[PDB]
Ligand binder design. Structure first.
Ligand SMILES: CC(C)(C)C(=O)NCc1ccc(Cl)c(C(=O)Nc2ncc[nH]2)c1
Ligand SMILES: CC(C)(C)C(=O)NCc1ccc(Cl)c(C(=O)Nc2ncc[nH]2)c1
Ligand SMILES: CC(C)(C)C(=O)NCc1ccc(Cl)c(C(=O)Nc2ncc[nH]2)c1
Ligand SMILES: CCCCCCCCO[C@@H]1O[C@H](CO)[C@@H](O)[C@H](O)[C@H]1O
Ligand SMILES: CCCCCCCCO[C@@H]1O[C@H](CO)[C@@H](O)[C@H](O)[C@H]1O
Ligand SMILES: CCCCCCCCO[C@@H]1O[C@H](CO)[C@@H](O)[C@H](O)[C@H]1O
Ligand SMILES: CCCCCCCCO[C@@H]1O[C@H](CO)[C@@H](O)[C@H](O)[C@H]1O
Ligand SMILES: CCCCCCCCO[C@@H]1O[C@H](CO)[C@@H](O)[C@H](O)[C@H]1O
Ligand SMILES: CCCCCCCCO[C@@H]1O[C@H](CO)[C@@H](O)[C@H](O)[C@H]1O
Ligand SMILES: N[C@@H](CCC(=O)N[C@@H](CS)C(=O)NCC(=O)O)C(=O)O
Ligand SMILES: N[C@@H](CCC(=O)N[C@@H](CS)C(=O)NCC(=O)O)C(=O)O
Ligand SMILES: N[C@@H](CCC(=O)N[C@@H](CS)C(=O)NCC(=O)O)C(=O)O
Lengths: 148, 148, 148
């Protein structure tokens, strides 16, 4: 198998795929909140589900969208950075720690966001998860630059 | 060529690249709608194109933005999942079917969204396209876990 | 090192990683503007930082969000396209030029957007940066199709 290309790769692929699934869960939650609160973005959706007055914004829907957007602002870069980083021959335990901190940080972020936990709990989880991303980015920069 | 690294890779690269181009088309459509409806997000844009009153929201512009955002919520994960999945030695025909269902589902989604087709046509196309993504995610999880 | 897999790869990894860091800078700027202008998206954030009246929109915050979103609409596709393109054996100088035009175009885009430069400066930087992306997409299409 080509997953054995690098010692850190399986750990990366596990954490990244779990986080993609976690984003899919947010998407599903968003849809279920739209239906339960009857708050649709489109008139065609609203007319199917009770009438044109249900084409409206809702605070819980907007919150779900913000969590999903923040995921796109953070998890997508990790998908790129963590993949490249996996092939730079990092220490397996150190790599594991990078991936685990991001995984735990991001899962905690979604729980804090959707669960409406007091500030700055969500903010701290964002910063915590950004740390391994910043670390990997710098390491990729050094490897790329030295190979020019 | 390194496209011959795996039998499923060319099919993946064709479908993914077509979908990226499809996202670029949505971006172009969005810009053209902004100009035609004179609905700009920025005062500097508005002042160039008729005056400050044209810094305003528009339902068709917002619809275009929603289609583009939904693309980012779905196609970007596919770019990651489908790439990794291509290297897991899946059955070539089965892999083809995963990529084709996503491609057809997503193109149909954009047509349904921008064309304002009746509910739940758009919703169904989203769910249909998510199926192969869910499938690939699970398969990656198993391969990653078994290599830890 | 696996960065020596293709002659164009180090150039790609340098430009892409710089652009991811550039997106992180936009995220940080956004947060700092929220705090300085006291414009928070969440009631829990607002109550921590002065009261419920500070859960409000702000034009500068919205501008930052638009720049970040446009980055997601353009840089993320480049991360995929440029990576694949790096392995298609392109002319090293030609590949360099693709990556440099995108890097300069996108950095200029963020400066033009956040700096509120007159139209159509921002619009032109977007189009300029899309050119190498369009080029790479077509090249990937040809390579993928010919390997089917
Ligand atoms: C799980 C997910 C699809 C994300 C969701 O809950 N979306 C909310 C949602 C929003 C607007 C509409 Cl119109 C529907 C709808 O009716 N859908 C449908 N009807 C029959 C089959 N499918 C659903
Ligand atoms: C195709 C795409 C670029 C996505 C589009 O249609 N954007 C809408 C758009 C929005 C605001 C402005 Cl200010 C312009 C504009 O004037 N642009 C320009 N002028 C000269 C060269 N370029 C265009
Ligand atoms: C740099 C970045 C994190 C992106 C930023 O400036 N965010 C703005 C922001 C928005 C809402 C809140 Cl509630 C905070 C906050 O208090 N955060 C915090 N307190 C203690 C530790 N961390 C910050
Ligand atoms: C990956 C998906 C994680 C979903 C986490 C959802 C956390 C729900 O948490 C709930 O939030 C409610 C407010 O939204 C509160 O009223 C409840 O007390 C709380 O249990
Ligand atoms: C947003 C603020 C994050 C700052 C923390 C930076 C993360 C540290 O990252 C470290 O950088 C060093 C120098 O590049 C490298 O030698 C290490 O391998 C790397 O772990
Ligand atoms: C990848 C880009 C696909 C673009 C699909 C656009 C579909 C346009 O479809 C059009 O939508 C209009 C409302 O928006 C309707 O008035 C028209 O009847 C319909 O033909
Ligand atoms: C959103 C709901 C989607 C549920 C459909 C799941 C897609 C099925 O996916 C299947 O999963 C099996 C077990 O992991 C694997 O053995 C198969 O290879 C895979 O095709
Ligand atoms: C990657 C991050 C790039 C940040 C570029 C910020 C450019 C700031 O530019 C500033 O913009 C202000 C309006 O916003 C103007 O009042 C100032 O004249 C101008 O210097
Ligand atoms: C948005 C408008 C962009 C149009 C510019 C297209 C970029 C040109 O791209 C070129 O395409 C040729 C044919 O596919 C290839 O032979 C070249 O390698 C490629 O550089
Ligand atoms: N787009 C973000 C940029 C800054 C950011 O990612 N902040 C973190 C920590 S405060 C966050 O959880 N933001 C909430 C959000 O993105 O909706 C924002 O507007 O807040
Ligand atoms: N962000 C999505 C999450 C759920 C989703 O992706 N739903 C599908 C099927 S109903 C969709 O086409 N949503 C429309 C959209 O994202 O604008 C939303 O708010 O609806
Ligand atoms: N989502 C974009 C699609 C078109 C686009 O990317 N336009 C460029 C050049 S005018 C841009 O800088 N748009 C500003 C933005 O996305 O906020 C939009 O609404 O404008």
């Amino acid at each position: 198998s080509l997953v054995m290309s690098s010692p850190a790769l399986p750990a990366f692929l596990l954490c990244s795929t779990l986080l993609v699934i976690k984003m899919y869960v947010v998407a599903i939650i968003t849809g279920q909140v739209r239906l339960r609160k009857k708050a649709f973005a489109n008139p065609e959706d609203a007319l199917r589900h009770g009438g044109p007055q249900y084409c409206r914004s809702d605070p819980d829907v907007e919150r779900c969208l913000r969590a999903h957007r923040n995921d796109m602002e953070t998890i997508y870069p990790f998908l790129f950075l963590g993949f490249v980083y996996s092939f730079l021959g990092p220490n397996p335990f150190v790599a594991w720690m990078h991936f685990l901190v991001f995984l735990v940080g991001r899962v905690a972020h979604t729980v804090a966001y959707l669960g409406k936990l007091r500030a700055p709990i969500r903010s701290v989880t964002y910063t915590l998860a950004q740390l391994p991303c910043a670390s990997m980015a710098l390491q990729i920069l050094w490897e790329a630059a030295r190979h020019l």
